[model samples]
Target: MRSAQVYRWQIPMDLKTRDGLYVCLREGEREGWGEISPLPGFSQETWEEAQSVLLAWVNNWLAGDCELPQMPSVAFGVSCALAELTDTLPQAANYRAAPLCNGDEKVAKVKVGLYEAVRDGMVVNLLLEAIPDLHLRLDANRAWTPLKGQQFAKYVNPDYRDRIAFLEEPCKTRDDSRAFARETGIAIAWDESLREPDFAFVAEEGVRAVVIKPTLTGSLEKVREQVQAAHALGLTAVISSSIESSLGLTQLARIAAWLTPDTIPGLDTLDLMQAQQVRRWPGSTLPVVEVDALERLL
Candidate 1:
């Protein structure tokens, strides 16, 4: 038997609302829970589209007809439920302090993304000076031209160069990304670029990592395939988040632990959410919720 429910949660700062679906598949004495939450801009499908697909899949599965949904988020959610049922779901072997930046002393690294590095070079330099042993992950989000990337990289002190993990998608084109890296000596990681059908993992001179957001990408199998391919080419596979609830965030952390245990994932957006319904951190214990309890929350 299978049952499903849908709920909505507001994004942090009340910027928008996101829909989440909970699916439960039962067999004999065992059951497993799966969560599907697709972000508006990040996911290839909209909430209504994903929800429709999920409903159909769940109904089919319950009727002894198995058909996988093509929507990435829905497929990933069903995968999680099946993995849990088979005891194949990954669990965090260890917990690392995520860079939530509440001035906590335990935070060894702080992340800053979406900043105009070229215009705020001096401010960034000051931040580097203020924090010791602070590793930085700069996500340019393809906002910089080749020359602008080079100019900002030059403003960064040589001493702090090694502290940077990677500058994510600094330039618009692959050729320009390579040029920016050559000019700045800053390693580059690919996120949006990987979504391109023609994208392939290349261990070129400047390419360092590939960010994998399973919900935005495709099925769990596809994510694992990409991670393995990235590893084969000596590229870091960073399991990132898509601003999902704690349910989806926890699953992403587990994927990171199982696939890329050494890398810090980009799952720090939970603090930005206004609610704490079913989401949890990597190493934290997630509470089990019944359908009735979920109904109350919804």
Candidate 2:
């Protein structure tokens, strides 16, 4: 028989009540866990809607109904739980930390919000000179206009230009993003743009990669499809997190390992949360717990 529980977990600090639903499932002797917390401004569905969908799915699953929830958060959680129970999780030892430790040429990520005060040219100039043999992945979060993006891209030294993995969502529109790349010969990646209903993979137009978050993109199958498609078109597929708990982040890490093992994922956002639920990155040596132990916590 399948059984599940729904509960709320609080956020640490004054983040305006970012808490959302957490789901734990037990099937026979095996157990699994999932999180359904949806970000207010970013996620397509509201928190209440995600919670309602998760509750309905859990109730139906317990009653022998096989219908899966459509909400992305619920889908992510339930699918992850099943994945956990099957012992089929992806393995990537020190996936995030490997790049940082690889010789002198380490890959690092920077959010544009962090260097907003500095001039665009100065930011890249200082970053390149400061870090030895540094490769940077800049995430703009769609904060720059086309002209501004062009200015930044143009300012980057051609010698160090290839060191940029990709600039994520630098412009407001797809056309602007492409134009920014065309004008300055820099590559770009799409994150927010992939959330659109009609989103299709285009190989040309300076698109070098896609930042995928399964929590916002529905089923794991859908995410896999996108990843495969991105690869088929010779584009990089970057698996990222959506500020989920340790449970969800673990699932994302597994997914990243499975799909894009060589790529550096964007799962380093866990430090922003108040507490660690299951796993800790970088320095932790503890093994991840199974579903049985996971059920007791939630």
Candidate 3:
């Protein structure tokens, strides 16, 4: 009823973000490409074993009987497969209702984390200068000290104070994050500190927004739970995906379509990678666009 294809990819460039410590992309088909949190020290063999498991899972899904079976990473794969089988895929309701650029100018202020060489201030400044007209939504990804978070909040929208959307996760500690948000009056969106199942506590604690990653959270059941919970509390929910290949991106786009335009959902960034063999949808820049494209390979 449905088809799928699985492939591995490499990070085209060094991924610098504020959430965690340094991470590297594992090389080759034997090794999969994804981030290792806290700068771990894993051997090549460990990476290969991980890749083996991932590949086996995909293979099983591809051979399954159901059409668009409920699989975790299949958001992209199932969407693409449906598009291939029927020539049409489901649309995300929110995205259709949302404007290309929501607030301020046609600009979106993105928040990044602070690391050694890639400092938060530096990244923020760079984005400001590059996309000056875009409204900013800075996220520390829980990588800042209380003092530093306060300092950065002061600098945001220095001239255009109203332009800054909010600062997300100034610090990791629950007490520290809440204190910073209360003191600075800057809204906070927790990313790494909170998972899908933890939305109740996140809402109870007065947390405003949650960034959902399909990979780390796992399965549509979990995702729907987060979405429902966030919506119930009138909080913002952003559906993000792991660094999956074209197959994963397709499912993410579908989810974004299904979810509609709630905060741009963090699903479309595959074009940032280097060369890949998969075929992307007509307008999409990433590979593995349609499921039929993958089926042809067989």
- Which candidate comes out best when scored by TM-score? 2
Model 3 C-alpha lDDT per residue in residues 100-191, reported as the tens digit of each score: 22122343535455353135555555555556665566656677777777666554444443344555667858679888777756677766
Sorted on TM-score, best first, the list reads 2, 1, 3
TM-score of each: 0.85, 0.87, 0.62
Better-scoring candidate (lDDT), 2 or 3? 2
* Tens-digit per-residue lDDT, 1-298, candidate 1: 4543444333443335546776666676666656677877677787778768877787678778866777888888888777776768765544343564423222233343355555445545556667766766666678777777776776777777666667778877878988887766778888888888898777788788887888878778888899999999988888887777767777777878888877877777666655545545644443434345554222
Candidate 2 per-residue lDDT over residues 202-254, each given as its tens digit: 77777788998888887777888999999999999988888776667767777
In candidate 3 the C-alpha lDDT for residue 282 amounts to 35
For model 2, the superposed segments whose C-alpha errors exceed 4 Å read 13-17, 91-105, 113-118, 279-298
Worst 10 contiguous positions by lDDT, candidate 3: 18-27
- Ranked candidates, highest lDDT first: 2, 1, 3
The Cα RMSD of model 1 versus the native structure comes to 3.5
lDDT of the candidates, in the order given = 0.69, 0.72, 0.47
RMSD of each: 3.5, 3.9, 8.8
